[PDB]
Amino acid sequence: LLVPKLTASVTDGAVGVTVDAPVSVTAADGVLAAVTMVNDNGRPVAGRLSPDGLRWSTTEQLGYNRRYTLNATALGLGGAATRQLTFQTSSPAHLTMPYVMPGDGEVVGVGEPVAIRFDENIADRGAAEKAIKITTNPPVEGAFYWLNNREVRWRPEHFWKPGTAVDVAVNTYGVDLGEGMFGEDNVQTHFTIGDEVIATADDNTKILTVRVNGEVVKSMPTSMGKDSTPTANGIYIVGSRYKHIIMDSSTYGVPVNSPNGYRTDVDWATQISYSGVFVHSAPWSVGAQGHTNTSHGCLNVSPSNAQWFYDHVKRGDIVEVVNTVGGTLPGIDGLGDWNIPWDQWRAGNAK
Numbered sequence: 001l002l003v004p005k006l007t008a009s010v011t012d013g014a015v016g017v018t019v020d021a022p023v024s025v026t027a028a029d030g031v032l033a034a035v036t037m038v039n040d041n042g043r044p045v046a047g048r049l050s051p052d053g054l055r056w057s058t059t060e061q062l063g064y065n066r067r068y069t070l071n072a073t074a075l076g077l078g079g080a081a082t083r084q085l086t087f088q089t090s091s092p093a094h095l096t097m098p099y100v101m102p103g104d105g106e107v108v109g110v111g112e113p114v115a116i117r118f119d120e121n122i123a124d125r126g127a128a129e130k131a132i133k134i135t136t137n138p139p140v141e142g143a144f145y146w147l148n149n150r151e152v153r154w155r156p157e158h159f160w161k162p163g164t165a166v167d168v169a170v171n172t173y174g175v176d177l178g179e180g181m182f183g184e185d186n187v188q189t190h191f192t193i194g195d196e197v198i199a200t201a202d203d204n205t206k207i208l209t210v211r212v213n214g215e216v217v218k219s220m221p222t223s224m225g226k227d228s229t230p231t232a233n234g235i236y237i238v239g240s241r242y243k244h245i246i247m248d249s250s251t252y253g254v255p256v257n258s259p260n261g262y263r264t265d266v267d268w269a270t271q272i273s274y275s276g277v278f279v280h281s282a283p284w285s286v287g288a289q290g291h292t293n294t295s296h297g298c299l300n301v302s303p304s305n306a307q308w309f310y311d312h313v314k315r316g317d318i319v320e321v322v323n324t325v326g327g328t329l330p331g332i333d334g335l336g337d338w339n340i341p342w343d344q345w346r347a348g349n350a351k
């Protein structure tokens with residue numbers, strides 16, 4: 001008769017054991033009679049033994065910088081076997097917490113990229129991407145692209161199809177993100193794509209036309225950026241919306257007391273770039289709207305049209321500006337992702 005065999009997922013004396021996966025023990029030619037795992041302090045980890053008694057596994061999160069001791073005994077018809085193993089888990093120099101947008105259970109527009117922002121610079125971008133699992137339904141090709149050292153975005157080639165489920169599991173706990181930086185925790189979010197809403201601002205007509213699934217539902221006279229501070233052409237993703245907000249030029253780099261500086265309270269503001277472009281209420285320019293550009297770059301519209309926009313446009317909806325004397329909105333603006341050519345985005349920039 002054969003003596004029971006014990007196999008563990010870790011080796012006695014191991015160091016740098018990653019904590020992204022459970023620790024397990026398996027018996028062969030017998031079953032597991034006793035398994036305990038204990039940290040340096042003496043506290044048990046505990047986990048669960050399978051019903052057939054063949055596999056034990058931890059069931060809670062294992063900690064960084066721990067010395068664990070595993071003790072296991074297997075019993076079989078042919079006798080007994082016991083083993084003791086001590087190992088040390090990863091010791092991070094730093095932890096980083098990821099933050100994901102959009103919010104869990106949200107419904108968003110067809111332009112919304114998956115956004116994962118880390119609170120620390122990521123030295124190994126590849127390791128981060130590999131730890132992020134995106135499920136789409138219906139399935140669609142997409143890719144990762146970094147806007148800066150901390151935030152990565154994922155999107156398809158073209159605007160999402162309405163009705164698409166998107167699931168984002170950021171599995172960075174126990175993952176080495178480079179230079180001793182490990183993930184502080186896992187995060188998980190899920191969202192759904194809603195109606196196709198695209199609003200086009202044509203500088204030739206100075207009308208902002210809102211299309212819902214192809215049909216015009218609103219036509220808003222607008223005043224865009226005056227020639228000296230023009231509105232950039234391109235595709236903008238709708239971000240946050242505000243019943244009212246103080247626009248502070250210093251937020252976007254420009255001292256208030258300077259020529260292009262400003263600090264003004266405005267109503268019904270919908271953000272469409274990080275660089276500070278908003279659709280908002282502009283009572284002072286209702287006579288210019290539909291005729292001449294007078295703003296610092298914002299899409300000035302009437303109070304009721306700004307409120308309409310606030311009520312009817314959602315995060316991830318699309319604003320496209322065309323035929324202005326500006327250039328093109330930067331691809332790495334923060335809400336300019338769609339202006340990056342697919343061949344470039346798809347190639348990514350992890351290295």
Ligand SMILES: *C(=O)[C@@H](C1=N[C@H](C(=O)O)[C@H](SCC(=O)OCCC)[C@@H]1C)[C@@H](C)O
Binds near residue numbers: 262276277284297299
């Ligand atoms: C957008 O253009 C910016 C924001 N909107 C405006 C604007 O009218 O362009 C303000 S300036 C308002 C001002 O100087 O006096 C208040 C009424 C005339 C501000 C510049 C920013 C967020 O891009």
